[PDB]
Amino acid sequence: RTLANATGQKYDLLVAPGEHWMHWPDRWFRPISTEYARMLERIKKKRPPSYRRGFRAAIDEVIPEEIRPEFTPYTWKSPLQKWAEELKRKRLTSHNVYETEVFLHPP
Amino acid sequence: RPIPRIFPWRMAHNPLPRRYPLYKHRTLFLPLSLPSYSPQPAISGVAVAPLTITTNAAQLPRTALLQSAVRQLRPL
Amino acid sequence: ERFLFLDEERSKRREEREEEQARLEEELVTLLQRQTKDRTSFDIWEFDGVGA
Amino acid sequence: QYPEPNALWPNPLLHNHRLKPFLHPAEEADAAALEAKQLRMNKHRLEHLWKFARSYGMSWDALDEVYIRFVQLKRSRE
Amino acid sequence: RAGPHISPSCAYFFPTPEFTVTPRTFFPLSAHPLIRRIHPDFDEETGNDHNPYAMHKLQMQWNHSLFIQERMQALRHFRNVANV
Amino acid sequence: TQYILNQLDPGGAGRNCSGIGRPDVRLPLAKPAAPS
Amino acid sequence: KLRLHQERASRGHIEYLRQLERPPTPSPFPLPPSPSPSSPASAAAAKAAAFAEQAAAQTPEPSVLVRSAEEWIKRDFFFPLSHQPDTATAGEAARALERELGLSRPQYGGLLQQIELPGFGEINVVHGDLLSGSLAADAMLVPVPPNFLPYRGFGLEVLERGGPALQKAAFVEVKRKLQQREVARDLLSGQAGREEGEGGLDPGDLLLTPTFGVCPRVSLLAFLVTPYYWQGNSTEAARRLRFTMRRALDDLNRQGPGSLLLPFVGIGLYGYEPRGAAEILVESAVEQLLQVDAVDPNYMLRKITFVDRDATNAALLAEAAQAAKRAWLPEHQVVPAPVYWSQKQRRLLDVTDGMLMFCRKHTRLSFKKHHGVIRRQKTHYFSNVRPFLWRSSRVLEPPPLLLYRHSGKPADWQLPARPFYRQGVSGLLFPPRLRRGFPSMRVNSKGQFVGVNKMPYIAEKAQPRL
Amino acid sequence: XXXXXXXXXXXXXXXXXXXXXXXXXXXXXXXXXXXXXXXXXXXXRHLVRLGXXXXXXXXXXXXXXXXXXXXX
Amino acid sequence: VDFSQNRFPVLNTAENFRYWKDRGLDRLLPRVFPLKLPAHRRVDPLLREYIFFLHSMDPARFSIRKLGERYGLKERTVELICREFSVAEFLRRTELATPYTRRVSREKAVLRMKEALFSLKLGYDQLGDEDLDEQEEHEFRGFRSTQDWIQRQNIEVEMMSAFPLPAKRNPLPKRVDVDVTVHNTSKLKVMNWIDPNDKVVF
């Protein structure tokens, strides 16, 4: 960091490229209200959406939610895979988890 | 008497472990680094272009194996 | 495979065929659970390894 | 030729079944000719099935179900 | 499209004499694969952070040696126009 | 958006990603909208 | 085809050369700026350096024997090093040897591979164009997404070519399938209630429609619902495709068509790995043609042709078909030579109880009783290592020789060579120029190759260590 | 009309009446100058329209749900 | 929450490179880390027997690749499972040794203890959890993984520009000698010594 700041050049660690100099501009994340969004959509000129660069862009504000897609049954899953996944999900979601018992054969 | 085998990586010493823990898991790692530094076009659809320096050459990934297979099929 | 079109004249269903297969399998399993050299005849029997 | 010892062999039932000859099903010249041709084609196909396959007539899913039932029985006993 | 014609030689740099905003990258271009990959214009299909074919023409356009040679040749032709 | 998503979770042809940005994957949005 | 040990050795040499070859990749050199950010002398040096480096990148270099030591030294200190040294390539001699051996001797190759299961059918692998190239088939299989509205790829191209008629037919079939599914679901709910007293098509779903003059080589288009690769792990991503292919082929066989044209299913829109997908495709085709699962076989599909337009993908499919031949066909089964000979001399022994007296020991566990620390390093090297080093290059044990199981003659396909690199580094920025390209030879003043008598240098190949 | 404006990685727009011409031009470009990737928003909505026409019964419900989600 | 002069919230940063790894006086804390166990010893023995049966019956239909694909394992893991089960079954059926009388190494005895305690604590896995074809993922895999050995540098010093820079000189693959067997019989093994630098090949 000292060398890069002093020189103005890139000093990149190969296990962490762009760690110190890469900066995503704040012009990317400027939220807008609904009225101003309408005005901007009116003023701006549209551009065709490129599939190669435009795909995988259907996301919005997210809130936490617990998921567990490791045990979701599907037609293609084999019977043994379904059986094992069902048993694993029962074990994980069981109420007896977090129960630490030092003795194998309890009193 | 047969001539003994000589492995090209331990020709003279045969390291072995002599310090606790005596039986921890040891994994072979052979660096791959960056075989090429120029833009590599995608093979069919796979990116191929490198993304990490930590790749192991004894545990080669999918796209590296694909490149190794395409080279063996090049017409020359 | 041995018979195929020779005896497939009677076979004309799918679910009924499955049921018949199940019945035959049950019969054979029950039989198992109970307890000449002319190549052109059906009387050739090689009891190799069959015993007590 | 008789396969060497493995998971599937020796197998007296399958051995005798394959030993048994190609029996018959049970104008006239045409019927007999067609029966003979079908028997010959069946013998050829069965020999080539023996050549190219060592297990058939079964579903991997069915084997998985059998294994699941076996292990479930063990777990109930335990 | 009604007015004065433009020289055919222009077609290499400016196929249209109409001004248009040319998109530009906003992050440095590296010769290293990883620094290139982290670039926002990086393309997994080609592996390069720009279009070399278009950047060649951009570099030619932004170069005084080529321009000064062209201008001096034009000046010599303009002088020859004095004879004819 | 796709660039940032790829940086956060690399994915693409021949890769196993979370499909979060894919138009055909469900996300836990706060304000529900058209899947598109 | 090669039957001579010399020819097979040349084949192995050519294969190793294939491994080591890397084609040249010229890159543009940036035009030096012509506003000067430095002194005029620096700018002139920069211009000259740029042109010289471009020339060095784009020009190759001959062997050492062409020039003298002083000339090479002067060149090394005066010019940028060339990116294509003589040792880089294999050589015209190797190329001609390959051409003579036939390994590497007007747009599509055609039939690249064929598996023939006599009495069951045939699986062909062909480099050809399905659409523009449309020697016969009944049904052509077209992969589609579950929603059946592709945005790019072979499915979209086929639908566009078919036009509104084929689109409407496919949509009608999809609507019928969805209505049947809804009816079945309602019946299931009613039956659940009686006992107490999802949505969209799944992978493996097949829809047969008329071609509407899309592919004249066929008279039927079978749209198949295929999975995606991103979901979960690679094991899941491939289990999906295996299940899909099993279901699709089984359903088509029950439908009846005896000939099928199949593209590389999974690749393209769905982002599968060609190398991993080809094995699944070919194995599924073989298993369905053999009717392994069925207890009552339905032998209807007998010709399956994997057609691909990309040379690389077609070659990968051919490799998968070759592996399938090795696995299935007893003629093409191969075995390591030691195992082959041991089993050929196989014998049945009679071991008694008294014959294992010394096969068992007093100790439960085994461990090394002496450390491997050398007391005198140079003495150990001189006494126990150096005398056995007849060459300074480091070479690994060769891969085992594969012999055909039935005959015992060497197999046409053999394991690739196994090179060794110290510490795993397999590249050099500046490889030294070597005279061993033409060993024991030099060029005389006349310009001809002549022999040289000279004691070989035992450490030549270990300088630098490789 | 049909305009193949090329801002980057030249793209084209098809109207379901020039699809044949677009396919012919794409094939010609791929034959002559390879690697000049061309992508066009060809027939996504074009297939969607015919799908809605075929599924008019459920297309009404789908459009109602889409409008509700967009309003939300 | 500390300060950063630039915006790059990713996991590929020097701070997050080896996440959770001690970077202060806590490096001297005697932490206990999870023990590593082989997958062929983690999977349930009944699954091992089932895999061995399938492979020893039909190695073509039940290929190593197919078995690994179905049971979420690697080809090497399947091979190890089959080898170990075949050895154990041979010993048991020939009555040479029981599972507790085969002389083994200390390392393998310790591995057996590790798997025994793993099963007693968590229980054997009923399905494989590996990946068939590992992926190109940025992870720390030892000190050898943190540097470019060919370049002999850990840091790529470069200038800032908005225009193309000269390309880096690519390395050339090392041309090392190999031995390729060409003719093997019960008495003689003949292999060709190949020198990839020899220009005249014939």
From TrEMBL, chain A:
It comes from the Eukaryota. This is Putative 30S ribosomal protein S5. It comes from Toxoplasma gondii.
Automatic annotation (TrEMBL), chain B:
This is Uncharacterized protein. The chain holds residues 169 to 244 of 419 of the full protein.
Automatic annotation (TrEMBL), chain D:
This is Uncharacterized protein. It comes from Toxoplasma gondii. The chain holds residues 390 to 486 of 680 of the full protein. It comes from the Eukaryota.
From TrEMBL, chain E:
It comes from the Eukaryota. Signal peptide: none annotated. This is Enoyl-CoA hydratase/isomerase family protein.
